[PDB]
Curated annotation (Swiss-Prot):
Glycine binds at residues 113, 115, 120, 169, 213. This is Glutamate receptor ionotropic, NMDA 1. Residues 144-281 are extracellular. Glycans are attached at residues 45, 68, 88, 155, 252. Heterotetramer; the NMDAR subunits are modular and harbor tiered domains that function in concert to regulate opening and closing of the cation-selective ion channel pore. Forms heterotetrameric channels composed of two GluN1/zeta subunits (GRIN1), and two identical GluN2/epsilon subunits (GRIN2A, GRIN2B, GRIN2C or GRIN2D) or GluN3 subunits (GRIN3A or GRIN3B) (in vitro). Can also form heterotetrameric channels that contain at least two GluN1 subunits and at least two different GluN2 subunits (or a combination of one GluN2 and one GluN3 subunits) (in vitro). It is found in: Cell membrane; Postsynaptic cell membrane; Synaptic cell membrane; Postsynaptic density membrane. NMDA is probably regulated by C-terminal phosphorylation of an isoform of NR1 by PKC. Its phosphorylated state is influenced by the formation of the NMDAR-PPP2CB complex and the NMDAR channel activity. Detected throughout the brain, in brain cortex, cerebellum, thalamus and olfactory bulb. A hydrophobic region that gives rise to the prediction of a transmembrane span does not cross the membrane, but is part of a discontinuously helical region that dips into the membrane and is probably part of the pore and of the selectivity filter. The extracellular N-terminal domain (ATD) is a site of allosteric regulation to modulate overall receptor function. Component of N-methyl-D-aspartate (NMDA) receptors (NMDARs) that function as heterotetrameric, ligand-gated cation channels with high calcium permeability and voltage-dependent block by Mg(2+). NMDARs participate in synaptic plasticity for learning and memory formation by contributing to the long-term potentiation (LTP). Channel activation requires binding of the neurotransmitter L-glutamate to the GluN2 subunit, glycine or D-serine binding to the GluN1 subunit, plus membrane depolarization to eliminate channel inhibition by Mg(2+). Disulfide bonds join 25-51, 41-52, 225-279. Belongs to the glutamate-gated ion channel (TC 1.A.10.1) family. NR1/GRIN1 subfamily.
């Protein structure tokens, strides 16, 4: 009966914290003074129960209420979003990350900042976008780069290292475009396992530029005054809920998302989780 929901750590959409010593989740309040809704999410720390909250968790709760379903949340085991790759040193291809879990049945729905792209749409179904965003670049304040067309990115050198997250939509964006071959070849040698690690690397001067989702990078840069983004987005894409094709939830999930875009719910999530205070971290 319970839907198996898979998600991934990705602030401000999904925060992941340890439970308190008694197994419960710390009582916290939003900027508006309301209780922060927290759900138990099992996953690698060893796999244990942890506390999850954020933009996507509030969205999941809204969907569950509106569509009248129960659920259990877990964090993707390999910590990745999902790309299709050859496995077991053979020519057989399988999806990794949340994509792989949804296709295998380990999950029934992906509720996370999951990018809608053509490659994934060939295998799964997406709801209409719950968030409209794109791609941008994160650098340390002081680093001078124009954007995706900067010579230090287009004419790669070991003097200026840039990368993205392994097995993600951004990795595929660069891998599937011949014009971006030189950039792809450079990043392939530097890609990180998670967005948090890449962001920390930029802060520590170990990575000079991190190419990633603007919804995430603009939030990170706006919370940390030592980090900035390169301005305008160089590509636009949306985040959607993922389900297996021919699922009984597709129509209703999109109806819920439509209602939330129409009545201010999505806008309120932005004021609660994305734009609400000056930098302090």
């Amino acid at each position: 009966t319970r839907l198996k929901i898979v998600t991934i750590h990705q602030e401000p959409f999904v925060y992941v914290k340890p439970t308190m010593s008694d197994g419960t989740c710390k009582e916290e309040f939003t900027v508006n003074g309301d209780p922060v809704k927290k759900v138990i999410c099992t996953g690698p720390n060893h796999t244990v129960p942890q506390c999850c909250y954020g933009f996507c968790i509030d969205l999941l709760i809204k969907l569950a209420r509106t569509m009248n379903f129960t659920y259990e949340v877990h964090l993707v085991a390999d910590g990745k979003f999902g790309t299709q790759e050859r496995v077991n040193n053979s020519n057989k291809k399988e999806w990794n990350g949340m994509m792989g879990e949804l296709l295998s049945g380990q999950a029934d729905m992906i509720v996370a900042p999951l990018t809608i792209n053509n490659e994934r749409a060939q295998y799964i179904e997406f709801s209409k976008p719950f968030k409209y965003q794109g791609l941008t670049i994160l650098v340390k304040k002081g680093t001078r780069i124009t954007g995706i067309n900067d010579p230090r990115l287009r004419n790669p050198s070991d003097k200026f290292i840039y990368a993205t997250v392994k097995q993600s939509s951004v990795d595929i964006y660069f891998r599937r475009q011949v014009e971006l071959s030189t950039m792809y070849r450079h990043m392939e040698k530097h890609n990180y396992e998670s967005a948090a690690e890449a962001i920390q690397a930029v802060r520590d001067n170990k990575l000079h530029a991190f190419i990633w989702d603007s919804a995430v990078l603009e939030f990170e840069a706006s919370q940390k005054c030592d980090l900035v983004t390169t301005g305008e987005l160089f590509f636009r894409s949306g985040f959607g809920i993922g389900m297996r094709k021919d699922s009984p939830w597709k129509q209703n999930v999109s109806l819920s998302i439509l209602k939330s875009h129409e009545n201010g719910f999505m806008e309120d999530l932005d004021k609660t989780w994305v734009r609400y205070q000056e930098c302090d971290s």
